[PDB]
Design an enzyme around this catalytic site. Structure first.
Site, PDB file in Angstrom:
ATOM      1  N   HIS B  41      21.548  76.592  41.886  1.00  0.00           N
ATOM      2  CA  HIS B  41      20.929  76.745  40.612  1.00  0.00           C
ATOM      3  C   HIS B  41      19.825  76.105  40.234  1.00  0.00           C
ATOM      4  O   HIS B  41      19.309  76.253  39.029  1.00  0.00           O
ATOM      5  CB  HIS B  41      21.997  76.938  39.315  1.00  0.00           C
ATOM      6  CG  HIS B  41      22.575  75.753  39.100  1.00  0.00           C
ATOM      7  ND1 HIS B  41      23.979  75.556  39.314  1.00  0.00           N
ATOM      8  CD2 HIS B  41      22.160  74.728  38.160  1.00  0.00           C
ATOM      9  CE1 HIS B  41      24.223  74.268  38.776  1.00  0.00           C
ATOM     10  NE2 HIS B  41      23.291  73.629  37.986  1.00  0.00           N
ATOM     11  N   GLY B 143      22.673  66.437  33.539  1.00  0.00           N
ATOM     12  CA  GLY B 143      22.058  65.749  34.744  1.00  0.00           C
ATOM     13  C   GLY B 143      22.984  65.112  35.858  1.00  0.00           C
ATOM     14  O   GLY B 143      22.619  64.870  36.910  1.00  0.00           O
ATOM     15  N   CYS B 145      24.960  67.363  37.678  1.00  0.00           N
ATOM     16  CA  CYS B 145      25.111  68.329  38.801  1.00  0.00           C
ATOM     17  C   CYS B 145      24.693  67.676  40.046  1.00  0.00           C
ATOM     18  O   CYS B 145      23.767  66.887  40.059  1.00  0.00           O
ATOM     19  CB  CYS B 145      24.127  69.340  38.352  1.00  0.00           C
ATOM     20  SG  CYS B 145      25.211  70.220  37.063  1.00  0.00           S
TER      21      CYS B 145
HETATM   22  C1  LIG Z   1      23.844  70.623  36.012  1.00  0.00           C
HETATM   23  O1  LIG Z   1      22.824  71.811  36.329  1.00  0.00           O
HETATM   24  C2  LIG Z   1      22.865  69.560  35.482  1.00  0.00           C
HETATM   25  N1  LIG Z   1      21.484  69.648  35.657  1.00  0.00           N
HETATM   26  O2  LIG Z   1      23.469  68.319  35.565  1.00  0.00           O
HETATM   27  C3  LIG Z   1      24.276  71.329  34.949  1.00  0.00           C
HETATM   28  C4  LIG Z   1      25.305  70.430  33.973  1.00  0.00           C
HETATM   29  C5  LIG Z   1      25.479  71.217  32.444  1.00  0.00           C
HETATM   30  C6  LIG Z   1      26.033  69.998  31.803  1.00  0.00           C
HETATM   31  C7  LIG Z   1      25.129  70.517  30.619  1.00  0.00           C
HETATM   32  C8  LIG Z   1      24.240  71.029  31.573  1.00  0.00           C
HETATM   33  N2  LIG Z   1      24.880  72.722  35.006  1.00  0.00           N
HETATM   34  C9  LIG Z   1      24.336  73.707  34.355  1.00  0.00           C
HETATM   35  O3  LIG Z   1      23.409  73.983  33.502  1.00  0.00           O
HETATM   36  C10 LIG Z   1      25.050  75.320  34.815  1.00  0.00           C
HETATM   37  C11 LIG Z   1      24.579  76.233  35.475  1.00  0.00           C
HETATM   38  C12 LIG Z   1      24.433  77.357  34.550  1.00  0.00           C
HETATM   39  C13 LIG Z   1      24.979  76.786  33.108  1.00  0.00           C
HETATM   40  N3  LIG Z   1      25.830  75.748  33.498  1.00  0.00           N
HETATM   41  C14 LIG Z   1      26.692  75.267  32.623  1.00  0.00           C
HETATM   42  O4  LIG Z   1      27.254  74.392  32.942  1.00  0.00           O
HETATM   43  C15 LIG Z   1      26.941  75.844  31.071  1.00  0.00           C
HETATM   44  N4  LIG Z   1      28.289  76.440  31.291  1.00  0.00           N
HETATM   45  C16 LIG Z   1      28.590  77.767  31.477  1.00  0.00           C
HETATM   46  O5  LIG Z   1      27.919  78.467  31.209  1.00  0.00           O
HETATM   47  N5  LIG Z   1      30.145  77.995  31.242  1.00  0.00           N
HETATM   48  C17 LIG Z   1      30.497  79.390  31.270  1.00  0.00           C
HETATM   49  C18 LIG Z   1      29.342  80.188  32.330  1.00  0.00           C
HETATM   50  C19 LIG Z   1      30.239  80.046  30.065  1.00  0.00           C
HETATM   51  C20 LIG Z   1      32.060  79.596  32.154  1.00  0.00           C
HETATM   52  C21 LIG Z   1      26.511  74.877  30.081  1.00  0.00           C
HETATM   53  C22 LIG Z   1      26.692  75.954  28.695  1.00  0.00           C
HETATM   54  C23 LIG Z   1      27.602  73.799  29.944  1.00  0.00           C
HETATM   55  C24 LIG Z   1      25.127  74.314  30.149  1.00  0.00           C
HETATM   56  C25 LIG Z   1      24.861  77.548  35.865  1.00  0.00           C
HETATM   57  C26 LIG Z   1      23.950  78.310  36.949  1.00  0.00           C
HETATM   58  C27 LIG Z   1      26.340  77.826  35.792  1.00  0.00           C
END
Ligand SMILES: *[C@](O)(C(N)=O)[C@H](CC1CCC1)NC(=O)[C@@H]1[C@@H]2[C@H](CN1C(=O)[C@@H](NC(=O)NC(C)(C)C)C(C)(C)C)C2(C)C
Ligand SMILES: *[C@](O)(C(N)=O)[C@H](CC1CCC1)NC(=O)[C@@H]1[C@@H]2[C@H](CN1C(=O)[C@@H](NC(=O)NC(C)(C)C)C(C)(C)C)C2(C)C
Lengths: 306, 306
Positions: B41, B143, B145
């Protein structure tokens, strides 16, 4: 999200761990530049133990009585001295992996990471606090002496603990890296009274702030308290006094959460008086006191290390 | 003496952590030999998120759209591929710090160490279990991930987890290092039901053995139970079934302590039915399920790593 008892990355310390042997006694040493630091009792016999005279014992030793092994490689000892309860072995080779480092003597209530080692080889890493009675609740077996505790700040490893002994309650005692014991302890086999421990109040408050940052507010209340009235309740529950300096240190967390320190003190008072009634905080059924204010800011903020 | 939630020494993993950037998205990667592994992603835009077609998205990218930074040094991406939910970036330089390693897909109930990282730099290390519902209760911020979980055996790092996402309950989901999610999760922003979790029974039993090894017997009783009758009580308390294979795995600890497995099961039954009545075990007021039988043997025995 989440909150764990988090240790510092240990790589910079692993590269410094060595094995020291004198006679039949083997333990760990810390190799920085061309010096290996280890507990001085490496020089003792079992029968030397009730009141060794370490000056007398060390004068009888030669450089060649000390065997230092770094991995597979034997390092030649070219000089030796004693500083308080630590032996300093000068060796022929400077450690190429020496990190930027300092030696620090910490205050009770501060936390650190321990790299538990055996025969010069790292086994694991965990987080400890220096208890108010100057013991630590570690995990140490025979052969772990000379394992060290540390904190990291940017690229600098601040060593603060070297392991020496186990007390009859199963807790642990040791020295700063200049060989001064924390607490009243001495490196002899004589009965030694560890003081009655207390709970580290400022750390409990810090961890309640961590619980709020992580989205949990169930233990909050509408009340406030004066510092004086809080400390009256602390005393009854064997908690350390909270000072205005502690209040100031909690400033950043109070500002981030919008909960004044003395308002959080009123929540802690209610928790001490009522219990949790079957609820948990950050996955614990007990009030946790081994996170400092800085530990909380670090983990709820994502500081890294160079 | 002592018993702590102990992580593996992280040095071998720290040397593998890098920063990967694509567009405005930055996260961590794992650099082994001449390949950098990271969550796929990284290629997505915020608006790509409800159902990205990753094949379609990746065909639109060039090697030069990926920026990999190891410390201060930019590594040139010379090739890229997707394997399940992980992106593999071939780079111009083999990592000189590559440890001996394997990739492993772990079973629920197994533990591992996480090296939490931000912008390619390690922040801390802690121990996790893979929950029965295939989430982990980590400590991860924006951050993190691409941070990885691992176990070490002699000199060999077995990577088992790469972090991808946070679920609405604050727990965490991710993949093996071949990019297959643990659990039913997918890397899209769609509602995703995490199953109801359960307690890892074999691990609770292991930790009760650890408590005995460390000198504490207060929760023992004179009773025994059949496996079948134990499992009837387990079910009521949302504990996983105990199998004969679990019983066999607990053999070494049972032999060391002289307490038969089904006798320890009778103690656990009494603890589930009665509670602790204000007592603790290994400093916990809850029954701890994130230590495996092997974790206990390791820490009560002092195994080290090469
Ligand atoms: C990592 O990519 C990173 N940059 O560290 C990131 C860590 C999260 C913690 C805040 C940002 N991961 C994502 O952004 C990840 C990517 C999208 C959205 N993501 C999420 O973790 C979201 N959770 C989510 O959508 N949970 C469901 C799908 C509702 C069960 C957040 C809302 C926590 C950002 C993808 C591709 C899953
Ligand atoms: C380290 O030297 C090592 N080899 O790892 C060793 C670790 C302990 C854990 C079992 C061996 N430390 C000592 O042996 C240390 C040395 C003597 C005796 N020591 C103890 O830790 C003893 N505790 C003790 O005597 N406690 C008092 C003094 C009664 C309060 C043991 C009984 C645990 C061995 C000296 C110089 C203190």
């Amino acid at each position: 999200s989440g909150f764990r008892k988090m240790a510092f990355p240990s790589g910079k310390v692993e590269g410094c761990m060595v094995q020291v042997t004198c006679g039949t006694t083997t333990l760990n040493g810390l190799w920085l530049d061309d010096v290996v630091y280890c507990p001085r009792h490496v020089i003792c016999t079992s029968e030397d133990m009730l009141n060794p005279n370490y000056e007398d014992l060390l004068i009888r030793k030669s450089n060649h009585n000390f065997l230092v092994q770094a991995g597979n490689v034997q390092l030649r000892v070219i000089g030796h001295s004693m500083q308080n309860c630590v032996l300093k072995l000068k060796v022929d080779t400077a450690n190429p992996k020496t990190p930027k480092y300092k030696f620090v003597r910490i205050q009770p209530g501060q936390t650190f990471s321990v790299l538990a080692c055996y025969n010069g080889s790292p086994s694991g890493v965990y987080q400890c606090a220096m208890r108010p009675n100057f013991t630590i609740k570690g995990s140490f077996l025979n052969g772990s002496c000379g394992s060290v505790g540390f904190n990291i700040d940017y690229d600098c490893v601040s060593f603060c603990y070297m392991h020496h002994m186990e007390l009859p309650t199963g807790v642990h005692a040791g020295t700063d890296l200049e060989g001064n014991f924390y607490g009243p302890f001495v490196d002899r086999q004589t009965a030694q009274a560890a003081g009655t421990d207390t709970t580290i109040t400022v750390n409990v408050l810090a961890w309640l702030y961590a619980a709020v940052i992580n989205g949990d507010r169930w233990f909050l209340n509408r009340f406030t308290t004066t510092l004086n009235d809080f400390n009256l309740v602390a005393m009854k529950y064997n908690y350390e006094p909270l000072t205005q300096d502690h209040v100031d240190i909690l400033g950043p967390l109070s500002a981030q959460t919008g909960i004044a320190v003395l308002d959080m003190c009123a929540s802690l008072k209610e928790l001490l008086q009522n219990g949790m009634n079957g609820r948990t905080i950050l996955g614990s059924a007990l009030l946790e006191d081994e996170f400092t204010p800085f530990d909380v800011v670090r983990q709820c903020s994502g500081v890294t290390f160079q």
